[PDB]
Structure 1
């Protein structure tokens, strides 16, 4: 079967991270939409203009709003993209056939929205050469960050070639986890986000979202299905593109 996949990049990244996976999925006959979230990729906004993870998710929400009645999509989020999925699901659950998490945070409905992010910071506290700054938006102090090049090289693009790593150094932008904003955000709902089918994809060779963290997430909020990809790194859509496409095809053949 064919599906319409909506690929969602992580913070400090953009649609470009999916440049290898998108054409492969299309070669299988699928429709693919790779969005640039707010102040990401070539989006015209700067991070200082964004005050929450919800605002950051605007392009995704706007896209879903534009889907004609009856049309459903399979959301695929990497790393922090799981949060955009949760936000989107609480507004357009009926338009989501399923959500695939790609070495991604997996929010739940029993704890605050920042719950898994707080846990992530405990498991991976040292972001190496990453730099930080603060800005104010809507009366709140937000911590912005720019991923360090060493962190990118050693923990995120561990096995990616020099040409993919180069794209990251050239294209990654300042962003934010909006951690303190998520902490005060209303909980994700059981009726919306809680109702969608969730497929968790990961590799135990991820050098940032460590096994301890991902296995902790799986136990915390049981996914409907779990796929473990052998080898690769945090950026499976670059290092195990074929494997990811195969998994997504099976998801398309399972949920609609």
Structure 2
């Protein structure tokens, strides 16, 4: 079977992270959309204009709204992308065949939206040369960040080629975890987000979302299906592109 995959990058990144996976899924016959989220990739907004993770998720929500009745997609989110999937599933769960988490946060419905992020900051507290700033939007002070080049080299793109790591230094932009507004956001709902099929893909060789954190998430909110990719690094769509497209073909063959 063929599916329509909507690939969702993590904070400080853009659609460009999917530049190897998107042609491979198309060579299997799938339709693929790789979005730039607010103030990400070549989106014209800057992060200081964004006041929440929901506003950050606007391109994905606008995209799902534009789907004609009866059209379903499979969402695929990397790292913070799982939170954009949860926001989207509470507005458009009927348009989501399945959601695939790719070395991603897995929000739940029994604790607040920041829960999993707070636990990530506990397991991985040192973000090395990452820099921080603050800006104000809609009454709230938000901490922005720009991922450090050594953190990028060693923990996110560990085993990626130098030309892939180069794209990250050239293209990663200022972002925000919006951790404080997620903590005060209403919980993801059991009838929206809780109802969608959830497939968790990970590698135990990920150097930032460590096995303790990822195994903690699988245990906290049981996925419908779990795939563990051997080897690679945090950016499995660059180091294990073929294995991710094989997993996504099975998901397209299982969930519609």
Displacement after TM superposition at 1:239 (Å)? 0.2
Aligned to 1:145, what secondary structure does the other structure show? strand
In 2, the alpha carbon distance for the partners of 1:205 and 1:111 equals: 28
User: Which residue of structure 2 aligns with residue 3 of structure 1?
Assistant: 3
Displacement after TM superposition at 1:121 (Å)? 0.1
In 2, the alpha carbon distance for the partners of 1:52 and 1:103 equals: 23
User: Which residue of structure 1 aligns with residue 193 of structure 2?
Assistant: 193
In 1, the alpha carbon distance for the partners of 2:219 and 2:138 equals: 36
CA deviation vs aligned residue, 1:193-222 (integer Å, no higher than 9, x gap)? 000000000000000000000000000000
CA deviation vs aligned residue, 1:69-89 (integer Å, no higher than 9, x gap)? 000000000000000000000
In 1, the alpha carbon distance for the partners of 2:190 and 2:137 equals: 29
Displacement after TM superposition at 1:120 (Å)? 0.2
CA deviation vs aligned residue, 1:19-64 (integer Å, no higher than 9, x gap)? 0000000000000000000000000000000000000000000000
In 2, the alpha carbon distance for the partners of 1:88 and 1:177 equals: 17
Displacement after TM superposition at 1:191 (Å)? 0.1
Aligned structure 1 segments of 4 or more residues deviating by more than 3 angstroms: none
CA deviation vs aligned residue, 1:109-163 (integer Å, no higher than 9, x gap)? 0000000000000000000000000000000000000000000000000000000
TM superposition score normalised by structure 2:
1.00
Displacement after TM superposition at 1:165 (Å)? 0.2
User: Which residue of structure 1 aligns with residue 159 of structure 2?
Assistant: 159
In 1, the alpha carbon distance for the partners of 2:175 and 2:128 equals: 16
Displacement after TM superposition at 1:100 (Å)? 0.1
Structure 1 unmatched runs, 5+: none
Matched residues, number: 256
Structure 2 unmatched runs, 5+: none
TM superposition score normalised by structure 1:
1.00
In 2, the alpha carbon distance for the partners of 1:117 and 1:137 equals: 21
In 2, the alpha carbon distance for the partners of 1:132 and 1:114 equals: 19
In 2, the alpha carbon distance for the partners of 1:24 and 1:161 equals: 18
User: Which residue of structure 2 aligns with residue 171 of structure 1?
Assistant: 171
